Design a protein around this ligand. Structure first.
Ligand SMILES: Nc1nc2c(ncn2[C@@H]2O[C@H](COP(=O)(O)OP(=O)(O)OP(=O)(O)O)[C@@H](O)[C@H]2O)c(=O)[nH]1
Ligand SMILES: Nc1nc2c(ncn2[C@@H]2O[C@H](COP(=O)(O)OP(=O)(O)OP(=O)(O)O)[C@@H](O)[C@H]2O)c(=O)[nH]1
Lengths: 243, 453, 311, 439
């Protein structure tokens, strides 16, 4: 939420400053390329924020799916039961076992609600929490998880690295927006007669943003290759959508 | 990031669309026509949120945060008589200026600039009546000259009155114009201000509207009321993401962030499956469609509300909102099928976006064939052809200067040369917009910053 | 427990009774995976095949307990290898198999020897259906490829190569499909009919199990299968050579379609190759005919003989 | 595996309606398309997927497209089967009623409105995943029907070179319109030789004769002929619609029946049926007898190349073996091709109402012999006679055929040449010297 709020703040600041340029630009022939570069950096920031929001929405979708499976099948187990009277156990070798005895199909020679009490509810809540924790993308710094190929870092570690990179991107975008506001004030003061140092700072910040975007694209391609080579269909679909 | 949105009804078509939208919202939230909510005020547990659109004066009454502004008092009086107590009589602006003296944009701009004090005072009053604000939603109705002028004046006031608010506009474009020259002049003069100040703009071409109204309805005769009912349903569906707060999209700013890549590209194209809340909605349970078929219909050109003219259309931001019991596996299947069928730019790796909303617990439940509906919004450059028709009319008639005796009165320019220069500047700005669109359609748009840093 | 439904499900799974469509769809979906696993070593990852099998089992109706409990696995030995290990006969292809974990109290009736018999029968039927699918795919290619159905420019090689290969494929079909029909009619159909008619007013579950084991023993000891395995081991290699020759001819036709003597030399090499292959296959068929005539088995045998004798 | 039915012309529409009604009565689908079976048991042994698409309402829409220049028959079929067919799968070309019984107008309409048919077939293919080919049912006598069939055949062969196309061609009878219908017949036959993959022939004269023989009323109706076409199509597709162990696709059937693409014309027969009493030996004897074939044999001893029969009913192996021995003794096979005789036991549909004459095992048989070449020679001789004796075909043409009449004569001469080469190849395969190039 901090990343998303910072992205939205930068977006509204850039939108307001561009609206101010469009209002009091007049003719301004020397600002056309600067506005084009600002729009390009805004598009890059928009792609960054779209990736961040896509990751956040995927995580929230998994969370809400777990919550729905907990409410419909655990909190409301006695209401609209799953009817799966067969209890199976899956092992690491792909073997399936039947848990306990096999009850008959309700056939007794004949010639209320199954609600959960205090301890059962507490245990099912604990199992729901453990199922939430056991996600591969949330299993941070664990020995059971496998690192991504050609990277040597786990998936949560690479996600934390991507978060740090997009936070640095947000910070350098805030710096670029401050430089742009200073250039805007200088243009309000004089008509393209000063602010050469501010223009140089803007150019250097744009180059830094471009280099950071290239590095982030390389890291994202590496993460995509990792998701494709992991084998999970969810990671495959996520990589395909990000690509 | 979620704020309230105030509705601005402008012109006859705009007022009709606003009335239809408010009636649809009342039907959805069980508010009714009398203004007093049909549901008892004791059931405060509401999954929706009428606060961004309905001001709650009393525990049972919810006045819509809307202002109607029109030069014809007859339609306003009819709307107020039909919706007894629903609308606010203080938010109705007529200025007692009589009927519009022609269909010129200059007349609307003049009637806006003259009574700018009253409308701005009403806007300030409506803003003071609330606390959290995000922006306005203007109904331009560019087909009418006076309505387009009033909308342009309202935009030119709001842009420098509230620069911290995001502005969205809805421009209804006709299919075949009677006075093609005057209507093209009005639409171009409105698009000038739309490119200048409007943050987001959604077009509505009447050709596809009439086509859908002839297809899904049984009566061959088409009426303007149920024609605007389609735009009303579209607006209600796109505002559902804020009325019934979802888990991903819950604010207009967050919705427009993934739809507006740059302030220059602020024109979208809508599409919707066969509706279910309209008059003739009985012929929907015989299609037997799923969410995948709904996505296919959304991506089909026959369900778009604007003239597609798809000649390898270049997409920039495609977004969809599905309301009903949606399946994630079916959504994934539809996405996999559409990513191999939708043309995507080689310079942008952004794909289509999917959002799932919630259905109203008080709306009439539909059978399992059409219980799930969908809306699609695509950033397509196909609107440049709709604008190219008008600019070609401008180029073929401007060589003589016809109908110049109508745009000279009212506006601040009474001479012919000033009006000619203004029309030439508007033609130049729409030409630059079309050039920017056709350049963004290419890969060099992103390469402009790659070739030089 | 619905023993009738249980026996129907096991006949559908292992015996292919009223379930040929499902196994044919599985084979057509996993053509490349099966052949790549058979051509590669044990290091080849079968995770994709396991995912396909598990998604097919999930899409299958959950009411079918046998199909929902069906598990897949890989054996380090081939079908002829396990046949020579289990019987007094002599032998990296067909390393796949399936299994059912019979629970309680159904395990006291369905033992593991009948499970192994079911696995062997299922592997044999899978081999037969895979060879039939390969033949059908070869025929479809030959009949749908324009590079094959196109001729002219004074060919003089059409009736020599394409007609000869079509006659060879027709003979292979009239052999394989004929023996498959004979089997599925005079062994599989008869055993299914007996297993359906035995439980009419039953008296002893142990007697039903003994009848089932006796039927499986008759299926395994039918002299048609024991005489075919030493000949089928060569017929399969003949089919492999035939389809690889078909692939090479398809890859060469697009280049032969119109100038040099090298092309004529390659055409001569191809025609002598395929003629030697056809002659070797004819000699092998004559040897198989001699073997089956020496074997003491006869309506289906006479039908197979009339189908395999050349005009 | 999924096959799409193509109903071309009014005859195609009639036979498609009859076939879909028969399949609905068999698989318990009814006229409303809804599943007439209870929702308590989902275990089924049939296969409705390649022929019916099941929607969320459990309704089975037939995978068929109707291409005809006469919307009247399509509207009548829709009125008779309201709630069964999909209105989106209907194609009337938006050109009004039919006009002209020549192949030229049909092919021109097809080439003009091919985009709509292409979009329809593309949507129908994309609706599912597993596809094998297409199924057409038409009569070569109808000009518009033959033109539409040739147009769709061209589209299929130049769009999907991997899907197999099977068609059912009803040849005209000995009538008066054959002076102009023979043109369309030979044009469609040239198209079949060029691009089609499989064809099942039907002779209208033999069909009407068998109809009058099996029916009490000698006034045989075209609806009765279409019902018999429905019955023969159901009997030949039972093996695909109820696959048990051996046959689960038409690919294997066409592999074991059609030896080479140059010989892809099959003659059907089916006996006994109405529209225990006969043992399987008697059924196969009647199948061998020419009085039960759906095409005019006109041959004392045809040269059988490949035969394949499907027996529907409870059978025992002894009668099968006896009839097989009798067929091997009677039927003569060439000394260069194999004498293969395939028998497939097709299961009966338990969801189908009991046909009259219960417990009467029946049998269908597809043959590739010298019976189709007689009809081919008769048609080509009539065409040659009418062409060389009267120059009236150059007065009814459309489009490019009407712009110049010389190209029409050249195309007809090429059609005569290709059918002559086909009959020469057939009469050569009849001889032992056909395979002499390898021996
Ligand atoms: N589709 C549609 N168009 C409308 C509707 N109402 C007005 N219009 C548009 O309005 C045009 C006719 O002019 P008017 O309706 O009088 O609009 P105006 O001239 O600006 O007058 P006012 O709207 O009262 O200010 C037509 O070309 C329509 O495009 C409506 O309900 N539906
Ligand atoms: N057996 C049979 N043949 C039919 C039927 N309807 C049409 N035909 C065929 O149609 C031929 C006569 O021509 P038409 O019926 O006018 O068919 P068409 O020339 O294609 O004209 P349209 O069907 O209107 O396009 C006959 O020789 C039949 O082969 C039918 O219901 N049953």
């Amino acid at each position: 939420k901090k990343n998303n709020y910072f992205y939205q703040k930068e977006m509204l600041k850039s939108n307001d400053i561009i609206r101010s340029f469009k209002k009091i630009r007049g003719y301004n022939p020397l600002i056309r390329d600067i506005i084009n570069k600002l729009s390009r950096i805004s598009i890059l920031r928009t792609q960054f924020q779209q990736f961040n929001s896509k990751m956040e929405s995927y995580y929230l979708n998994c969370i809400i799916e777990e919550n729905f499976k907990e409410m419909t099948r655990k909190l409301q187990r006695t209401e609209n039961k799953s009817q799966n009277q067969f209890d199976l156990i899956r092992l690491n070798n792909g073997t399936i076992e039947l848990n306990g005895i096999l009850t008959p199909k309700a056939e007794v020679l004949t010639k209320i609600e199954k609600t959960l009490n205090i301890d059962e509810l507490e245990s099912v809540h604990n199992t729901f929490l453990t199922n939430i924790l056991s996600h591969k993308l949330f299993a941070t710094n664990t020995s059971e998880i496998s690192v991504g190929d050609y990277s040597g870092q786990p998936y949560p570690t690479s996600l934390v690295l991507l978060l740090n990179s997009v936070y640095e991107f947000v910070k350098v975008y805030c710096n670029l927006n401050d430089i742009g506001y200073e250039i805007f004030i200088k243009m309000n003061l004089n008509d393209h007669e000063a602010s050469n140092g501010l223009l140089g700072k803007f150019n250097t910040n744009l180059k830094e943003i471009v280099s950071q975007y290239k590095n982030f694209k390389d890291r994202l391609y590496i993460f995509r290759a990792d998701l494709k080579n992991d084998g999970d269909e969810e990671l495959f679909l996520l990589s395909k959508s990000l690509r | 990031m979620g704020g309230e949105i105030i509705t601005l009804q402008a012109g006859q078509c705009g007022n009709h669309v606003g009335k239809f939208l408010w009636s649809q919202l009342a039907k959805e939230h069980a508010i009714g026509t009398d203004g007093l909510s049909q549901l008892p005020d004791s059931s405060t547990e509401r999954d929706d949120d009428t606060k961004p659109f309905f001001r709650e004066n009393s525990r049972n009454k919810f006045t819509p945060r809307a202002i109607m502004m029109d030069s014809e008092p007859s339609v306003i009086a009819d709307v107020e008589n039909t919706f007894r107590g629903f609308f606010d009589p203080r938010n109705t602006w007529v200025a007692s200026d009589g009927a519009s003296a022609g269909n010129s944009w200059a007349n609307g701009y003049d009637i806006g600039t003259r009574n700018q004090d009253d409308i701005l005072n009403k806007i300030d009053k409506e803003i003071d009546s609330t606390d959290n604000f995000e922006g306005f939603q203007l109904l331009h109705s560019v087909a009418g000259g006076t309505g387009s002028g009033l909308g342009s004046n309202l935009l030119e006031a709001l842009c420098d009155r509230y620069p911290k608010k995001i502005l969205t506009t809805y421009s209804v474009f006709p299919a075949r114009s009677s006075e093609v020259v005057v209507q093209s002049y009005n639409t171009i003069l409105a698009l000038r201000r739309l490119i200048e100040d409007s943050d987001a703009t959604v077009v509505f071409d009447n050709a596809s509207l009439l086509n859908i109204s002839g297809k899904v309805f049984r009566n061959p005769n088409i009426d303007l009321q149920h024609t605007n009912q389609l735009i009303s349903t579209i607006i209600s569906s796109v505002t559902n993401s804020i009325r019934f707060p979802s888990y991903m999209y819950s604010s207009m700013s967050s919705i427009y962030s993934t739809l507006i890549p740059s302030p220059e590209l602020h024109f979208l194209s809508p599409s919707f499956t066969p509706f279910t809340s309209d008059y003739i909605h009985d012929d929907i349970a015989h299609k037997g469609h799923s969410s995948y078929d709904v996505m296919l219909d959304l991506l089909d050109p026959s369900n778009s509300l604007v003239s597609t003219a798809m000649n390898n259309p270049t997409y920039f931001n495609v977004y969809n909102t599905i309301i009903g019991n949606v399946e994630p596996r079916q959504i994934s299947r539809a996405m996999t099928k559409l990513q191999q069928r939708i043309k995507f730019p080689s310079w942008s790796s952004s794909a289509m976006h999917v959002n799932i909303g919630r259905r109203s617990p008080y709306l009439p439940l539909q059978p399992n064939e059409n219980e799930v509906s969908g809306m699609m919004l695509s950033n397509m450059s196909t609107v440049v052809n709709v604008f190219e028709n008008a600019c070609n009319t401008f180029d073929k008639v401007f060589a003589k200067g016809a109908f110049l005796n109508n745009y000279n009165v009212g506006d601040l320019f009474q001479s012919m040369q000033n009006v000619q220069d203004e029309f030439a500047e508007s033609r130049e700005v729409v030409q630059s917009l079309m050039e920017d669109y056709v350049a963004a359609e290419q890969d060099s748009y992103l390469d402009d910053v790659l070739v030089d840093d | 427990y619905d023993l009738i439904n249980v026996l129907k499900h096991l006949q559908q799974i292992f015996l292919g009774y009223q379930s040929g469509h499902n196994v044919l769809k599985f084979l057509t979906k996993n053509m490349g995976e099966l052949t790549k696993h058979y051509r590669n070593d044990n290091n080849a990852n079968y995770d994709k095949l396991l995912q396909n099998f598990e998604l097919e089992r999930q899409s299958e109706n959950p009411n079918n307990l046998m199909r929902q409990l069906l598990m897949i696995q890989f054996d380090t030995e081939t079908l002829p290898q396990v046949l020579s290990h289990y019987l007094q006969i002599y032998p990296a292809i067909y390393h796949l198999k399936f299994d059912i974990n019979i629970p309680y109290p159904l395990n006291i009736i369905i033992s593991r020897t009948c499970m192994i018999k079911y696995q062997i029968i299922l592997r044999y039927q899978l081999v037969l259906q895979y060879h039939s699918r390969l033949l059908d795919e070869t025929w479809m290619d030959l009949n749908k490829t324009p590079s094959w159905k196109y001729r002219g420019y004074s060919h003089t090689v059409k009736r020599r190569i394409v007609r000869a290969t079509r006659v060879l494929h027709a003979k292979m079909n009239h052999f394989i499909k004929t023996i498959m029909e004979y089997f599925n009619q005079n062994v599989i159909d008869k055993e299914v009919y007996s297993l359906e008619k035995c439980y009419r007013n039953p008296t002893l579950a142990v007697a039903i199990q003994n009848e089932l084991e006796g039927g499986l023993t008759n299926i395994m000891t039918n002299r048609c299968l024991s005489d075919l395995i030493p000949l089928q081991l060569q017929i399969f290699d003949i089919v492999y050579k035939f389809c690889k020759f078909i692939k090479s001819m398809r890859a060469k036709l697009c280049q032969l379609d119109p100038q040099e003597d090298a092309a004529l030399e390659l055409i001569q090499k191809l025609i002598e190759y395929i003629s030697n292959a056809s002659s070797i296959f004819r000699k092998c068929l004559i040897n198989f005919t001699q073997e089956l005539s020496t074997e003491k088995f006869a309506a289906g045998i006479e039908r197979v003989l009339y189908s395999i004798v050349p005009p």
